[PDB]
Structure 1
Amino acid sequence: PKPINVRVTTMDAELEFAIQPNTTGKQLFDQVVKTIGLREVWYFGLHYVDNKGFPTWLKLDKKVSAQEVRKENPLQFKFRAKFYPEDVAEELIQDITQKLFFLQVKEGILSDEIYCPPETAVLLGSYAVQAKFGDYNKEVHKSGYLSSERLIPQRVMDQHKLTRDQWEDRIQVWHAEHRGMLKDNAMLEYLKIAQDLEMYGINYFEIKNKKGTDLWLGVDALGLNIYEKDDKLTPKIGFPWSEIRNISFNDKKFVIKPIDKKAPDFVFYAPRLRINKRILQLCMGNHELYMRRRKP
């Protein structure tokens, strides 16, 4: 049948090819992973923009054409990590898997998506520099080699009065320390530090409790968390996966069910139904990757 053009990009690559009207996300997903040689497939997914202009994760069991991928030529997809390990240093096996997490995480940090203290920003940047430029040359890297490199998130530059050259220096000092550090190690250290940030690996959604006050819901690898609208850094309430029996909503009425009893039980509400759908798949996937790392 009439081939359908599609482009799939990873954090550092563009792949374009043709599929058929009956091709499944799984079938598209597979070609993508086998092409780049990544087998730790449980962290990833393919997401797109629908005809309405809205973010959407591709279902792997249904026909690609069976979902509303914005009509255009070709269709556009982003291969990204949908789930994070509880500990990158111990779990991530492949280099590719590592590289891909290093890049997506660094992108969220550089975009001000993930809050980051000024000091942790220069150290993270120092590692990104290592991974890229190398060991550090005083001949090749004459003041100004980091001139073109966007190294500190803007929201951080916004709160600390420093010259673009000022930072570049702060970074250089730390760069120099990592003597002959392997590029593949530099990336893991960056992730070892990013991992400790309070907003790392969390998906936030706006909600309201029965009492109707605005709050943030966070879904992550360790479980769920409830936050006050004005503070995404410190969870007001924490419900680890271990402590959560069943999570489910009816109609905007989500409810968390515990294991041990005492919990009066949490009940929140979310607006658009588009959201409440993703929320549930995130819990499901996280809850299940949680259990695997712990068999029996």
Structure 2
Amino acid sequence: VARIQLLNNEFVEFTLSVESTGQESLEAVAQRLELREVTYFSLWYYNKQNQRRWVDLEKPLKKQLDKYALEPTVYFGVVFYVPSVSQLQQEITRYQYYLQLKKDILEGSIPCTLEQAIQLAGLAVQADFGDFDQYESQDFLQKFALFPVGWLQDEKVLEEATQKVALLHQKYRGLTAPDAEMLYMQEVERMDGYGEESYPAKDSQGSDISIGACLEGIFVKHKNGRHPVVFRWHDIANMSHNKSFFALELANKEETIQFQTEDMETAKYIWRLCVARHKFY
């Protein structure tokens, strides 16, 4: 018996056969949610080094969890981030996407100042609880996750910010939940780090780098103080892996750029996800 953790802090148990693929589990989650735009979403697990890894949806799920996972839990989530949530057509799709974006914020995976957090929390509170005066006090706000890694904030800062959220909340009276969610996602959309996943590596000259995927293409960051380089999706002719190396074949001069990742299994994984993102964009 395995577990699928959903985007709203609920879970589903399920019996894992030997042959059932990751795709089959994803489709079952989608039927459960009545989600009709499933292409943006997939399933991930924590690997044996506690790193997040998206499931190979083509392969049987159970072998993947046995071989690479610490425990038989997968997480439902957005694997293909969209430049504009307005391209999501249906309310159920937007709501799931909203839950993911709120998660990205509350976990700190999209960095966020406290003032940005207060503005986002005001919209989330309107979306999640509706108009402020249905609740004869806002003392319930004190016991909810409102802010990124909020439990680590000083109590006085936390009290003050929660009071600001309560006041922002009153200003949003009359906003429906779909509209409040869209306004929330529209803000998160424009924040640095939205849609980004990255991995440690070295470039062909031994320097340490972070490499990964963003909306625009494959990015590389060095730790000097300069600026990241982005290989735009359409400037990328092909991608490959061999041993621990992951490679981009660029369209301009057929130049091939190598990157050395932690091991051969990591290079294959990075390759698989980056190929899939290239195809999606």
Give the TM-score, by structure 2 length: 0.86
Q: What is the CA–CA distance in structure 2 between the aligned matches of 1:42 and 1:17, rounded to whole Å?
A: 22
Q: Secondary structure at the match of 1:47?
A: strand
Do the aligned partners of 1:112 and 1:155 also contact (CA within 8 Å) in 2? no
Q: Is 1:113 paired with 2:104?
A: no
2:265 maps to 274
Shift of residue 81, structure 1, vs aligned partner = 1.4
Taking every aligned residue pair, what percent have the same amino acid on both sides?
27
Asked if 2 retains the 8 angstrom alpha-carbon contact of 1:51 and 1:68, the reply is no
* CA deviation string 1:128-177 (max 9, x = no partner): 1111121222x73535342112212238975x995222101222332222
Partner of 1:293: none
Q: 2:23 aligns with which of 17, 23, 26?
A: 26
For residues 84-95 of structure 1, what are the structure 2 equivalents within 5 Å?
84-88=81-85, 90-95=86-91
SS at match of 2:234: coil
Q: Distance in 2 between matches of 1:50 and 1:59?
A: 13
Aligned residue identity for 2:90: Q
Q: Aligned partners of 1:165 and 1:6: how far apart in 2?
A: 39
Cα distance, 1:76 vs structure 2: 2.5
RMSD: 3.0
Counterpart of 2:244 in structure 1 is 252
TM-score, normalised with respect to structure 1: 0.82
Give 3-state SS (helix, strand or coil) of 1:23's partner.
coil
Specify the alignment match of 1:226 in structure 2: 220
Structure 1, gaps ≥5 residues long? 291-296
Higher helix share: 2
Contact conserved, 1:126 with 1:174, CA < 8 A, in 2? yes
- Asked if the contact 1:135–1:178 (Cα under 8 Å) also holds between the matched residues in 2, the reply is yes
Equivalence for 2:142: 147
Task: Give 1:133's aligned amino acid.
Answer: F
Pairwise mapping of residues 48-67 of structure 1 onto structure 2 (< 5 A)?
48-49=45-46, 55-67=52-64
Q: 1:268 to 1:176 in 2, by over 3 A?
A: same
1:6 is displaced (CA, Å) by 3.1
In 1, are the aligned partners of 2:126 and 2:173 still within 8 Å (CA)?
A: no
Say if 1:44 and 1:79, in contact at 8 Å, map to a contact too.
yes
User: Secondary structure of 1:147's match?
Assistant: helix
Q: Which amino acid aligns with 2:206?
A: G
CA apart distance, 1:223: 0.6
Moved more, 18-27 or 199-208: 18-27
Q: For residue 189 of structure 1, what is the amino acid of its counterpart?
A: L
Q: 2:190 matched to which residue of 1?
A: 196
- In 2, the alpha carbon distance for the partners of 1:71 and 1:276 equals 15
Residue 247 of structure 2 is aligned to residue 289 of structure 1: no
Q: CA deviation at 1:37?
A: 0.9
Shift of the 193–170 alpha-carbon distance from structure 1 to 2, 3 Å rule, reads same
Are the aligned partners of 2:65 and 2:72 in contact in 1 as well (CA < 8 Å)?
Answer: no
Note the residue ranges of structure 2 that are not aligned, 5 or more in a row.
none
Note if 1:214 corresponds to 2:208.
yes
